[PDB]
Design an enzyme around this catalytic site. Structure first.
Site, PDB file in Angstrom:
ATOM      1  N   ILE A  93       0.841  -1.190   0.000  1.00  0.00           N
ATOM      2  CA  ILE A  93       0.000   0.000   0.000  1.00  0.00           C
ATOM      3  C   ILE A  93       0.879   1.243   0.000  1.00  0.00           C
ATOM      4  O   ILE A  93       1.950   1.255   0.605  1.00  0.00           O
ATOM      5  CB  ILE A  93      -0.963   0.013   1.199  1.00  0.00           C
ATOM      6  CG1 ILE A  93      -1.899  -1.197   1.154  1.00  0.00           C
ATOM      7  CG2 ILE A  93      -1.757   1.309   1.230  1.00  0.00           C
ATOM      8  CD1 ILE A  93      -2.753  -1.262  -0.093  1.00  0.00           C
TER       9      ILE A  93
ATOM     10  N   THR B  46       6.545   0.964   2.791  1.00  0.00           N
ATOM     11  CA  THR B  46       5.706   1.872   3.562  1.00  0.00           C
ATOM     12  C   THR B  46       4.655   1.092   4.347  1.00  0.00           C
ATOM     13  O   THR B  46       4.832   0.817   5.533  1.00  0.00           O
ATOM     14  CB  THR B  46       5.010   2.910   2.656  1.00  0.00           C
ATOM     15  OG1 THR B  46       5.977   3.513   1.788  1.00  0.00           O
ATOM     16  CG2 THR B  46       4.351   3.999   3.489  1.00  0.00           C
ATOM     17  N   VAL B  47       3.564   0.728   3.678  1.00  0.00           N
ATOM     18  CA  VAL B  47       2.460   0.004   4.295  1.00  0.00           C
ATOM     19  C   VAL B  47       2.291  -1.324   3.572  1.00  0.00           C
ATOM     20  O   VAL B  47       2.163  -1.356   2.342  1.00  0.00           O
ATOM     21  CB  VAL B  47       1.154   0.818   4.260  1.00  0.00           C
ATOM     22  CG1 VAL B  47      -0.002   0.001   4.813  1.00  0.00           C
ATOM     23  CG2 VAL B  47       1.316   2.108   5.046  1.00  0.00           C
TER      24      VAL B  47
ATOM     25  N   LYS C 198       3.337  -1.144   9.199  1.00  0.00           N
ATOM     26  CA  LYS C 198       4.104   0.064   8.911  1.00  0.00           C
ATOM     27  C   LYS C 198       5.582  -0.287   9.023  1.00  0.00           C
ATOM     28  O   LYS C 198       6.097  -0.479  10.129  1.00  0.00           O
ATOM     29  CB  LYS C 198       3.721   1.190   9.869  1.00  0.00           C
ATOM     30  CG  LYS C 198       4.383   2.545   9.598  1.00  0.00           C
ATOM     31  CD  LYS C 198       4.574   2.848   8.115  1.00  0.00           C
ATOM     32  CE  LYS C 198       5.394   4.114   7.920  1.00  0.00           C
ATOM     33  NZ  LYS C 198       5.882   4.264   6.521  1.00  0.00           N
TER      34      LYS C 198
ATOM     35  N   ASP D 103       0.416  15.786  15.481  1.00  0.00           N
ATOM     36  CA  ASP D 103       0.307  15.844  14.026  1.00  0.00           C
ATOM     37  C   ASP D 103      -1.020  15.316  13.489  1.00  0.00           C
ATOM     38  O   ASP D 103      -1.062  14.798  12.367  1.00  0.00           O
ATOM     39  CB  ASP D 103       1.483  15.099  13.369  1.00  0.00           C
ATOM     40  CG  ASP D 103       1.521  13.610  13.705  1.00  0.00           C
ATOM     41  OD1 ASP D 103       0.678  13.117  14.483  1.00  0.00           O
ATOM     42  OD2 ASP D 103       2.410  12.920  13.167  1.00  0.00           O
TER      43      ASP D 103
END
Ligand SMILES: CNS(=O)(=O)Nc1nccc(Cc2c(C)c3ccc(Oc4ncccc4F)cc3oc2=O)c1F
Ligand SMILES: CNS(=O)(=O)Nc1nccc(Cc2c(C)c3ccc(Oc4ncccc4F)cc3oc2=O)c1F
Lengths: 275, 226, 275, 273, 278, 226
Positions: D14, D15-16, D28, D121
């Site tokens: 999908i 990093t992922v 992740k 964030d």
């Protein structure tokens, strides 16, 4: 997680009826002699190591005044309530999805070395109508190298759902993977048929002796013909009177996902959609 | 009454779900004698398929009640043939409109495919309630009409035409239900699906979406019977 | 004189799960027996309908019935208040029992059981030491008998019940009759006669019942008529087990009938009350 | 929470990674060929804070990967983030759905601040609508526990505080920065468009919010629901730290407006069975 | 010769390029034996907006100049836009700055002439502005050609990409930072900072917001007088007028004596770059 | 046709969703003339409610279309008046059955209040589709219907029964929609809610649930009006 909460929760009234609370949203609560302290310590310890979606989430324990635990407030009702009180018609894919979710959760539990020993249809909570929850670890245990040294205690529950070697107590520890396997199989049985096993007997110690000697098994004739044969033989060979013949959970999940890939669908024959 | 006025009344009652009324308005509008456009053909097909589906669900319920009662009074069965005569009359008027002007004025090959597909479908809905020699003559007529339908569709449409896929799935359901040819239904559906998967790259995004809404049903049906 | 029964008319006084309450339209002391149960509402409506039959049972040696209802998700059966209590606390505060009182309660149980058989054709199925009740007036009455078959089917799941008194001919699914009840009567009589089980898990108990002969009392502590009485009451095979007509003409029961014992004086001296 | 590498396998990217470990999971993974020690430090802070997170409104975590490539394994959410629904899918939510989403994320952040953690964030890319009904809060890679010079912010400048834009304090992160980012979120879903869409220069936005000229315009919010939302979104977006309220108050205002809100457009009567 | 190689390269899809070396990488077409590049920019936007973006960026085929880099094409694949790009062997000038450290003044004059010619070409043909003149957008080859790249051809793509990268260094004009009218004077301003920054190697005066504050409220820095020629300082200070009204436009930069002197100079940039590589 | 046979046919129809069919069937059954039972009364109420609610939804859609078109053809007005005449005919038919024999043979006060509720509600719908002095005479009749029903209910009958609760709810609905009486509607709704909450403690569990199913609606429309 760990730690002690405080009076931020609400109190309703000083096995009851309601114990629902209110702390960062709705929650669920349970409830001075040391035998409660031991079991309370064990259940706190076993809920410290529960991180999965299929199991109720534990976040807090409080000790002062009464002894209690807090978990999130599930929306819905138990599988026993859905099957024997409301009798809501569940379609086939929903039922097998429930079976897959429960098997996956208990596979995670046994992979992380947890023995529940007391899984029940009254204990399986169907949250929201889609996702099932597994809880009530008050008598769950962690096996180890010295676990056979101690002598296990009496369940004092409903006799319908323990293994023959459990009710025979021929050894120090009858509880193992295969006892929970047999419990999950009889859960599959009551999920398929829709009624509790041995309905033609109105006496308890009848059931105790009658399956204690292996003289009876739950009837597989009441399984529906539209049911796939693979989970039929799964139910058949997972309730075997021999401990070794009962399969372990990983191949159970493998068979269930193969059946999922080979599932049929909803009824009728699907004509042209009105596009 | 004006043809376009009947068309907008039909659109209005489509938005107001008064399907028998808007079916009557387009019955008059097609009785005016002009050829139909694509959206008018869509409206006709949707209206008559909804009407036949409603009385078909009623007929299925009554047939289930009758068959569980045939394991007390003839009310159930006589109401069943009452609803059956209603459905037979409705399908008879629709087929009469078809063979009166539609199937002969379908100069466009696309319109001919659409009309043959619907007329084979209406024979199929008649075969859903037929019993005797009516069954065999109706199923032979549907067999023929479907056969030239797939012939002309294969000779002049792209493989991923949604109406071509829809007549393919109607024909597979035809074999399963009334023609009793499950292997031929499965074979037709798998060939049409696989060759559609070969030809899926030739469409735009919306045409591909219209094709996805048919291939998902095709996959569901193949997993259902296989 | 007591009309329709509602929960607001009952106020809690004490606990005997059995409570003690009072009916404020009448002012009489009332026995409050509550049991938890979960089934469809139509089934418990049927249960209420078939326990309406409880009105017609009237005898000096059966506890009187007054009414019932269903409230707060809990099925409520009501009981006549029985001040002397069951024999369990009597043997707890007395240790052992005289044989004359055993003859009197044998008279009571046979008279009540023949009344039930001749007036309703319904046996008891739960003749326990706990189910035998006494009062300051000396009336020994029965209770909790098996009147509503759907109710046995309802609670058949759980009884807690670490100890059982159920007959061997009822284990193998064979024909069951009053021989089971009089066999359990013999067990109850020998149990409070010695005050214990003079010979540990439930499965071992029922295994000893099914595969081993019943024990025999020593001769030097009881009369020979009592020993022959219990030996005729502890015959394993029901056919050789003597029925009611033999036990109403036994020498021991005639001696007990001919005896005149101040059992009311003994019980009020045991409980220590001034009426 | 130690996990061996072999029993977790990757299926799709999908990093992922969409992995499988007792069912589908979300992985992740940090692909760094030469891992440097401050990455180990940030990894340790992520693991340490995620071990302490146990709630229904958050993204639930199970275990970590140490050997080979560094990875974090969490549960697989069903659906997509709120950014895709609001700005790409454009799904026409109704107003009670918006209120329920706001209440749920308010409850989650209120518990998360009750643990005294600053997420620092949060934005629409980090809120996941599970089964289209429940919200989940994730991506705790920049969170910290209150207890040095702050590291420079790296996310998009729209959601972060004007004070951390002004980078004047040593550690400007606090409760009120989260409150103001939450206020931007409530500006976001109740109208459906990002703030300052008429301006397409990043540092122009940075300077204008730093000097104090910039202000989100409540003009484009609809007036059908009453003025309670108006004063709420006005109060929670205020520039000064002390005038931004705390989360029990915003919760209480949310249920106070929920007690007096009807779901019916007409007069219903006898329901035909 | 750039157009005739384009005619030998037809339709270009995702599969037939192979990975070799926002993010920039390098491809090569196996049959033609040509080395290209691609530009990968990730967005999360509606498909209709994506089609608007692709139709707006199709205009770049007409942008042909010796001072503008070549355009190949672009296609949407794997949830991202890939802009097919001609490969530049020498790389951008920040890598050259890290390789060497300082740039000779004649090279500065040549690249100033090149960027002035590119800006005049863009204003005379497409009448638009570059909006991101910077040393990373200046590309050089071993053939000695200097061309511009990475300009705002699509305003919708500007609106799309405006929510992305933070920005550590800023080459922003104060007038559009304030929000006023902008013209080529902003690009001349940013050209001035870029040229002085790559001439001395660093910014002579830290967080991005205070840099923005310094650009707004402080006079721009000036070079020492005793280092270089006075005409060079006059040239860059003519480039560095804060108010764009008196800031010189393209024609005054073109008629400047520094530009004429640098054009009169003959510089072997290709030979010096080959000496730098080896 | 036999009376119990028509009742069984109506049961078959309500499990076969043929609403005009069940309506004609019990129209024959009520033209038989015998007094009906509570379940038959409930079935007729819900069935003609389904019918006239369908025509009412169609009329509301057409009224919205006509009021958007009255800011270019009288077709919208013609169709609206056509379905309005349909609704007037079916309401007049129901009212004619009522005043023919139902309100005269209603001996028990429960069916008395039930039939008063019915004929007042069809007065309400006729007034919804009416406009003018006819409308004010119709709402006068609806008034007299509602106050007679609630007088009988309040005199002889406890508040927590669902027919009285629905009568008061429909009373407030009629005030707010037609008479424009929000204060009176809110006052009656809150008074009925308070009386029902006071009196609900003497009921069984199913009766309590059946009452709270529309106490939820009462709390909701009080919330909506406030
Ligand atoms: C190993 N035996 S078993 O497994 O078959 N279990 C069972 N056997 C037989 C019966 C039952 C249940 C029983 C119960 C407990 C019961 C209780 C009260 C009752 O009211 C009154 N009773 C007497 C006098 C006045 C009353 F108001 C009727 C009852 O009726 C019942 O039937 C069993 F659970
Ligand atoms: C402080 N910056 S700002 O706020 O002013 N915003 C912006 N300024 C300016 C531009 C843009 C966007 C931009 C970009 C990113 C872009 C990149 C490559 C591209 O390919 C080629 N380029 C040149 C020649 C041949 C090509 F094939 C076209 C591009 O087109 C574009 O539009 C901005 F977002």
């Amino acid at each position: 997680d760990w730690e002690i909460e405080a009076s931020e929760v609400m109190l309703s009234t000083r096995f009851g009826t309601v114990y629902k609370g209110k702390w960062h949203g709705d929650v669920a609560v349970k409830i001075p002699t040391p035998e409660q302290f031991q079991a309370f310590r064990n259940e706190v310890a076993v809920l410290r190591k529960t991180r999965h979606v299929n199991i109720l989430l534990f976040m807090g324990y409080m000790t002062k005044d009464n002894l209690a635990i807090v978990t999130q407030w599930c929306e819905g009702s138990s599988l026993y309530k859905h099957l024997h009180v409301q009798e809501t018609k569940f379609q086939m894919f929903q039922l097998i999805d429930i079976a897959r979710q429960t098997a996956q959760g208990m596979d995670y539990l046994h992979a992380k070395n947890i023995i529940h020993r007391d899984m029940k249809s009254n204990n399986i909570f169907l949250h929201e109508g889609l996702t099932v929850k597994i809880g009530d670890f008050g008598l769950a245990t962690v096996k180890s190298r010295w676990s056979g040294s101690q002598q296990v205690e009496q369940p004092t529950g409903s006799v319908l759902w323990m293994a023959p070697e459990v009710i025979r107590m021929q050894d120090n520890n009858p509880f193992s993977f295969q006892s929970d396997v047999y419990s999950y199989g009889i859960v599959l049985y009551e999920l398929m048929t829709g009624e509790l096993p041995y309905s033609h007997i109105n006496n308890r110690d009848q059931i105790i002796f009658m399956v204690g000697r292996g003289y009876a098994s739950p009837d597989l004739s009441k399984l529906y013909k539209n049911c796939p044969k693979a989970m039929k033989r799964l139910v058949a060979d997972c309730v075997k009177k021999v401990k070794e013949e009962r399969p372990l959970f990983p191949q159970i999940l493998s068979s269930i996902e193969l059946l999922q890939h080979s599932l049929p669908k909803i009824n009728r024959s699907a004509s042209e959609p009105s596009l | 009454m004006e043809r376009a006025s009947l068309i907008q009344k039909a659109k209005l009652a489509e938005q107001a779900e008064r399907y028998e009324d808007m079916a009557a308005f387009m019955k008059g509008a097609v009785e005016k004698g002009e050829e139909l456009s694509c959206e008018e053909r869509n409206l006709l097909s949707v209206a008559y398929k909804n009407v036949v589906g409603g009385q078909r669900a009623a007929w299925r319920v009554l047939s289930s009640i009758e068959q569980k009662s045939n394991e007390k009074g003839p009310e159930v069965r006589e109401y069943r043939e009452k609803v059956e005569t209603e459905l037979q009359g409705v399908c008879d008027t629709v087929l009469g409109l078809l063979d009166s002007h539609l199937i002969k004025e379908a100069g466009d090959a696309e319109s001919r495919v659409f009309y043959l597909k619907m007329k084979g479908d209406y024979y199929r809905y008649l075969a859903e309630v037929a019993t005797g020699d009516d069954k065999k003559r109706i199923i032979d007529s549907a067999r023929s009409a479907y056969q030239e339908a797939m012939d002309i569709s294969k000779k002049e449409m792209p493989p991923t035409n949604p109406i071509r896929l829809g007549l393919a799935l109607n024909f597979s359901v035809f074999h399963y239900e009334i023609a009793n040819s499950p292997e031929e239904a499965i074979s037709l559906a798998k060939t049409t699906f696989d060759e559609a998967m070969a030809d899926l790259h030739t469409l735009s995004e919306d045409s591909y979406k219209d094709s996805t809404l048919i291939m998902q049903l095709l996959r569901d049906n193949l997993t259902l019977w296989t | 004189k007591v009309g329709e029964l509602k929960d607001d008319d009952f106020e809690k006084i004490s606990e005997l799960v059995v409570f003690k309450v009072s009916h404020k339209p009448s002012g009489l002391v009332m026995a409050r027996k509550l049991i938890h149960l979960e089934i469809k509402p139509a089934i418990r409506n049927q249960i209420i309908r078939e326990l309406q039959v409880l009105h017609e049972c009237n005898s000096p040696y059966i506890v009187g019935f007054y009414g019932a209802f269903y409230s707060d998700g809990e099925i409520s059966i009501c009981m006549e208040h029985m001040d002397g209590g069951s024999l369990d606390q009597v043997l707890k505060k007395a240790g052992r029992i005289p044989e004359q009182i055993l003859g009197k309660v044998s008279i009571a149980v046979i008279k009540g059981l023949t009344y039930l058989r001749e007036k309703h054709k319904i046996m008891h199925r739960d003749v326990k030491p706990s189910n035998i009740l006494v009062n300051s007036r000396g009336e020994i009455k029965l209770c909790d008998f098996g009147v509503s078959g759907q109710l046995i089917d309802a609670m058949a799941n759980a009884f807690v019940g670490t100890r059982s008194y159920m007959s061997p001919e009822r284990l193998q699914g064979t024909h069951y009759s009053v021989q089971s009840d009089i066999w359990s009567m013999g067990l109850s009589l020998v149990e409070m006669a010695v005050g214990r089980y003079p010979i540990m898990a439930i499965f071992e108990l029922l295994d000893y019942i099914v595969n081993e002969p019943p024990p025999k009392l020593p001769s030097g502590v009881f009369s020979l008529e009592f020993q022959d009485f219990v030996n005729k009451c502890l015959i394993k095979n029901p056919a050789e087990r003597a029925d009611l007509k033999q036990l109403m003409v036994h020498a021991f029961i005639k001696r007990s009938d001919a005896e005149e014992v101040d059992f009311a004086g003994w019980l009020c001296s045991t409980i220590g009350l001034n009426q």
